Amino acid sequence: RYDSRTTIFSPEGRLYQVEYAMEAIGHAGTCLGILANDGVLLAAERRNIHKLLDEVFFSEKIYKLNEDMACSVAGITSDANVLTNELRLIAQRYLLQYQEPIPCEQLVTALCDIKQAYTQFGGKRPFGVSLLYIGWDKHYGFQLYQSDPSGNYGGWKATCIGNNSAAAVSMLKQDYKEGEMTLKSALALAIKVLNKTMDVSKLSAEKVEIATLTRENGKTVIRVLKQKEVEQLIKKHEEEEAKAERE
Amino acid sequence: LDKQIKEIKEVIELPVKHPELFEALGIAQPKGVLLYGPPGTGKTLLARAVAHHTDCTFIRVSGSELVQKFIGEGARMVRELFVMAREHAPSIIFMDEIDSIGSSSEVQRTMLELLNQLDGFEATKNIKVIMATNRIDILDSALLRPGRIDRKIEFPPPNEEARLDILKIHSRKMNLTRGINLRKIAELMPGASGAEVKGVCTEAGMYALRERRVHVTQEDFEMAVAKVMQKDSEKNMSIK
Amino acid sequence: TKGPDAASKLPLVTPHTQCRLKLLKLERIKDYLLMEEEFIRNQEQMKPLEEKQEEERSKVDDLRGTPMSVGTLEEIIDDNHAIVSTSVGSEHYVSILSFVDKDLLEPGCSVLLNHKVHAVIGVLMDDTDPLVTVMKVEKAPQETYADIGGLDNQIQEIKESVELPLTHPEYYEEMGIKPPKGVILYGPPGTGKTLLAKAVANQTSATFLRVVGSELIQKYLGDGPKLVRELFRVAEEHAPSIVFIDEIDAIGTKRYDSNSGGEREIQRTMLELLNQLDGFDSRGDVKVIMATNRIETLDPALIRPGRIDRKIEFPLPDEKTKKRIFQIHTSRMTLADDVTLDDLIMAKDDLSGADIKAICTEAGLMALRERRMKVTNEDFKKSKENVLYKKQEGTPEGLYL
Amino acid sequence: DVLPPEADSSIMMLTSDQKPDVMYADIGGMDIQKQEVREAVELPLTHFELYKQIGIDPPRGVLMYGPPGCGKTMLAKAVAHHTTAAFIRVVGSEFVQKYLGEGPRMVRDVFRLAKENAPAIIFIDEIDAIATKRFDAQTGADREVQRILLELLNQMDGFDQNVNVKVIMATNRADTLDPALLRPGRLDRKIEFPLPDRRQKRLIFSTITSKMNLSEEVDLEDYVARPDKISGADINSICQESGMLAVRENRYIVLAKDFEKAYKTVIKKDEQEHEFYK
Amino acid sequence: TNRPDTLDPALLRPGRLDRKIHIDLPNEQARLDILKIHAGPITKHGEIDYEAIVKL
Numbered sequence A: 001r002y003d004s005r006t007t008i009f010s011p012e013g014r015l016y017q018v019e020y021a022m023e024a025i026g027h028a029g030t031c032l033g034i035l036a037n038d039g040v041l042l043a044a045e046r047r048n049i050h051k052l053l054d055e056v057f058f059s060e061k062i063y064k065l066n067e068d069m070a071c072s073v074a075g076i077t078s079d080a081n082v083l084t085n086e087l088r089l090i091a092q093r094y095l096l097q098y099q100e101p102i103p104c105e106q107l108v109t110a111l112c113d114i115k116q117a118y119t120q121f122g123g124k125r126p127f128g129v130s131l132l133y134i135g136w137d138k139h140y141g142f143q144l145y146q147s148d149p150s151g152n153y154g155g156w157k158a159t160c161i162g163n164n165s166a167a168a169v170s171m172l173k174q175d176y177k178e179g180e181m182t183l184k185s186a187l188a189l190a191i192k193v194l195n196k197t198m199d200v201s202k203l204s205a206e207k208v209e210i211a212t213l214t215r216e217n218g219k220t221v222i223r224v225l226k227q228k229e230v231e232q233l234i235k236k237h238e239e240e241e242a243k244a245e246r247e
Numbered sequence B: 001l002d003k004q005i006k007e008i009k010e011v012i013e014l015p016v017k018h019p020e021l022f023e024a025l026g027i028a029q030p031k032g033v034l035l036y037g038p039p040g041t042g043k044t045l046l047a048r049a050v051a052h053h054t055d056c057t058f059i060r061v062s063g064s065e066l067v068q069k070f071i072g073e074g075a076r077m078v079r080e081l082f083v084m085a086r087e088h089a090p091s092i093i094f095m096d097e098i099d100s101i102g103s104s105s106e107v108q109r110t111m112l113e114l115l116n117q118l119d120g121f122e123a124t125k126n127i128k129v130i131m132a133t134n135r136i137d138i139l140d141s142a143l144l145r146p147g148r149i150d151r152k153i154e155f156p157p158p159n160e161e162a163r164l165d166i167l168k169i170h171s172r173k174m175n176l177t178r179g180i181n182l183r184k185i186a187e188l189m190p191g192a193s194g195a196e197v198k199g200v201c202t203e204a205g206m207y208a209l210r211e212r213r214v215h216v217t218q219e220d221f222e223m224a225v226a227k228v229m230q231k232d233s234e235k236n237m238s239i240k
Numbered sequence C: 001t002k003g004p005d006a007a008s009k010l011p012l013v014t015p016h017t018q019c020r021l022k023l024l025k026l027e028r029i030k031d032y033l034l035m036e037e038e039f040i041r042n043q044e045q046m047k048p049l050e051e052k053q054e055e056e057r058s059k060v061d062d063l064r065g066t067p068m069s070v071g072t073l074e075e076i077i078d079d080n081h082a083i084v085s086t087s088v089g090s091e092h093y094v095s096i097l098s099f100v101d102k103d104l105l106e107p108g109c110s111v112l113l114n115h116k117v118h119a120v121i122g123v124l125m126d127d128t129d130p131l132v133t134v135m136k137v138e139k140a141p142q143e144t145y146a147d148i149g150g151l152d153n154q155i156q157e158i159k160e161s162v163e164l165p166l167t168h169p170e171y172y173e174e175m176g177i178k179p180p181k182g183v184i185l186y187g188p189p190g191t192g193k194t195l196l197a198k199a200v201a202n203q204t205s206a207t208f209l210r211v212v213g214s215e216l217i218q219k220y221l222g223d224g225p226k227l228v229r230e231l232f233r234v235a236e237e238h239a240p241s242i243v244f245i246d247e248i249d250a251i252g253t254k255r256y257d258s259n260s261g262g263e264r265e266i267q268r269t270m271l272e273l274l275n276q277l278d279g280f281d282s283r284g285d286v287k288v289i290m291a292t293n294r295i296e297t298l299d300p301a302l303i304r305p306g307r308i309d310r311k312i313e314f315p316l317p318d319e320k321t322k323k324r325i326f327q328i329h330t331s332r333m334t335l336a337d338d339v340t341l342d343d344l345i346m347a348k349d350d351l352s353g354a355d356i357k358a359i360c361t362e363a364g365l366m367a368l369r370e371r372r373m374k375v376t377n378e379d380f381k382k383s384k385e386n387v388l389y390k391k392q393e394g395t396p397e398g399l400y401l
Numbered sequence D: 001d002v003l004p005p006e007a008d009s010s011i012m013m014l015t016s017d018q019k020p021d022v023m024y025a026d027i028g029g030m031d032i033q034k035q036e037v038r039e040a041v042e043l044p045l046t047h048f049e050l051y052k053q054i055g056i057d058p059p060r061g062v063l064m065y066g067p068p069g070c071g072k073t074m075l076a077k078a079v080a081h082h083t084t085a086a087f088i089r090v091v092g093s094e095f096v097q098k099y100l101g102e103g104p105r106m107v108r109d110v111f112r113l114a115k116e117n118a119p120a121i122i123f124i125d126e127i128d129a130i131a132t133k134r135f136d137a138q139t140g141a142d143r144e145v146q147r148i149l150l151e152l153l154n155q156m157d158g159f160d161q162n163v164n165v166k167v168i169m170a171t172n173r174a175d176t177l178d179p180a181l182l183r184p185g186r187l188d189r190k191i192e193f194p195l196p197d198r199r200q201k202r203l204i205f206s207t208i209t210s211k212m213n214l215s216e217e218v219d220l221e222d223y224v225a226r227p228d229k230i231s232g233a234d235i236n237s238i239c240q241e242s243g244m245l246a247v248r249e250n251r252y253i254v255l256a257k258d259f260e261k262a263y264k265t266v267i268k269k270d271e272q273e274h275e276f277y278k
Numbered sequence E: 001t002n003r004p005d006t007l008d009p010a011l012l013r014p015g016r017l018d019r020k021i022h023i024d025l026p027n028e029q030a031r032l033d034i035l036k037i038h039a040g041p042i043t044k045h046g047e048i049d050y051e052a053i054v055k056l
Ligand SMILES: Nc1ncnc2c1ncn2[C@@H]1O[C@H](COP(=O)(O)OP(=O)(O)OP(=O)(O)O)[C@@H](O)[C@H]1O
Pocket: B039, B040, B041, B042, B043, B044, B045, B046, B047, B132, B158, B166, B193, B194, B195, B196, B198, D157, D185
């Protein structure tokens, strides 16, 4: 009805196309992040697993936007690549101009402004991608942010974006503690959330991917856990579940 | 699904058997009950169950509408039907479709007549209605008003325990041998549709028949589970 | 001319509780009804003079056979040989005199005649289509206004339109203003339009007329609008009165072309109804009330001054009207002190009266489930959750605004 | 005196007495499908005491899915020819404009027929139009088909009016099929009808050519072991056209070159293409 | 008949519809023969340049 053109305004002040994009974000792999003071963690569900696929790349839903930040994406693949490239360009431009790393909020707001611009003109359709950013900077320590197709963004201590985000956020809000995670508890909580939300059982290590950003000797370290660490973590979670049995 | 049975009993049997309780309470007794199960499992089977212990004139309309067709009587489902039902003072009617005759053409005239007739404004009581359908949201809001319809009941897919219970129920006649483990069968068939349990049982029986035996085995039931489920896949649409 | 409804069996039961007054009040009512029964039980018993052992009547009995046929009185002839046709068009010029009053002779009015000699019997039958005579009602359902609460503006408007005219025209007469005739009540479903309709029906000095919108779909082609024309004629005949049409969005909707060519013909009914409502001639002294859920869909031609002089919206009670309805409903049931109606009222928005009735009933049912006749706040806490589950809306407008 | 009953299914009982006259062995190759459909329909209609002994509630719904021309309508015809039930197909896909929703108008009759004489069976393909998936509920004249499908579902599942009235659906490529009319208790047996493969083309060739002049020099093995995918309708057409080619030259017995010509003619693939689309 | 716009692949399959015959394109000489045939039941002088007429 009042659709097709991004520009038209529904008689109730609703931009239907952008809302359609927001909804359609739901057809995306699960992705979530947790603040976990002294560090920060990102995890995602590597859906669409097939025997023949090779997986030669280094992660698929996790990217290194910068020597101090990282981000994860959910939505159309082409738009994902476009936005990741743009983010890297923005970060490097700022570094060149000021000779200092880009604060996370500035990068987020720049990309979000691009998205809004796309939602503002009639030539083009809104970006159908939403993403999470995790980083550190001198101004505000560690930070986690979320950005949506409409162009709006926020900061959170923990949040999930894609697929069954509702259940994930419910569990997080009913289980997360403020200022006490210390990472390891964050990893355990993330694994539990993935286990519950993900359809597959036993949480095959191949299904999930995990990255963690921390500080050490004044430099940031952004390392993606390999198979062995995830195997140990999931084994620990399963053992704990068994321990809770009969008690 | 004991909870659903208890609720339906409360809303149907109690008012037509214990008016004193309600009148003492001082609250008008309920009239309308809606059954909406996304898969539809059990839905009017519950309907037939309540019909059995009806103790009152059980009316039922399930054939689309009936003669709602080219001219000869506009909205013949109503007026005459309800005066008939009210003639048999205690009675309950069944609308198995609840997807036709109202979702928002010339068809909706009869739906409006039905809504008016069921609503107040000189309407009597002692009648009750149960409606069966899937995806109630498409149903018109008017029919979803609390006044016309009071209780809404969803039939979620049975869990492992409910799946086991229904399997036991449909396996009473089966000559299951010693060794089968219904627990396992319930476990490895998540997302059951209720009717799927009866289906797996029947197909297992057929498997036993083909070999010309009178015994069913854990292997047979596992083959049954495999046969019942159907999977779909297609590559290069895995984007997003 | 005629009269109206004759229900109203002493609407003064005003304790509304288990008190000896209502035991005394109702036993007075039992006393006057038993005596009026006994007054008609022996009324005929007294004065054996049963029509003077009989006279005159024998003549009418013998002159007219046991069965009386009916027909249409055609052109009259002074010699009593007015032409009359039977149901099969059996036109016959036939004599017409017995002990029969020959002053109510009109073309087109049903007349009675003899089966064998076809002679006019006498009693020019005075009756109409039974499909409409059934609609006439003389039993007020429930209380007039006390039950309804919060719609002071709407009740004021409807009162001015209907009740005040047939109570005191002094203002209208002196100022020369003709009272408004047509009123269309509209709003979201369950707001209570039906409730107010019944309300006025309980306190209408004039005869009430009830019709559902989807009642003029007579199968046979044509006919139809004849139904509504006869209905209006009947209503006009029976003294002043009000005609109520529920769910009017079934006979008039945007008056769009046949399109597929099915020739639904309901458009013809709508046009005839509109003509009868306001076109040529004069309507007379008849009020009209219309109720529907969607009004915009109605075609403009039906909705205009002179046909619907008032459009009355029924909005969702916000807080005050909501509280009025809530405690009005809860009054007739035992409730606990701890209950906080205002708490629930504030907590929830976009709630209509039907939902209030449903939620109070469900709370009572849950309390009975717990085996406690008295209710508690927690009962309502569970009830409002159970009832308000079907509603699920809201686009992902949770961040951008 | 109450007169005997009147009215008749389709033209008459079993769609009149005109049986399709096809023998299961007369149509060979679909051994598996034959066995499955037989177990589904014939056994319960025939002695079902074994079913009771098992206590199985024999199924009443089975559909056969396969490309358009791989043995279907012929299988139903054979079932009609070698059954004892009052098989009243009479299910011409009826959009109609006046009488809408004749589902109950028919099934009830058949059930009335079923109890009148004995349990009946139904069969049809090209029901894909009625499949749909609901979607919009407002667009006028578009929801009539959904009303028809809902009436059909209600009649099929409905109530305990069982009389083992079996149903056969031969419209397939089941994606538009509503899950409502696809579930155990609903149409139960899903049986595939793949393209006649190697070792099946030989059976079909032998069965069709049984009654033929058979020059005795054409080796059917050449076509049996030859590549390329060909459905049974195509094989029958090939035989027919070979015979016509033979008769055209006033040749009473079909010769090998005639068979070769027929095979070449019937194989025409797209026959237009556009040299793009690859 | 060429009237049916829709053509059924099952019909054109060998058997049902054995073969299809395309109406030949008139060559303007078949036109001359047709004119002669129709010229038959016509009264005329006889000095008819039928070829000239068909070319006209
Ligand atoms: N848990 C269950 N208990 C009883 N019957 C069940 C159950 N699950 C499936 N069934 C079977 O499924 C059928 C339910 O019929 P019902 O009246 O609910 O049909 P419906 O509402 O039209 O939809 P559906 O075909 O999905 O049931 C019956 O055959 C019933 O025996």
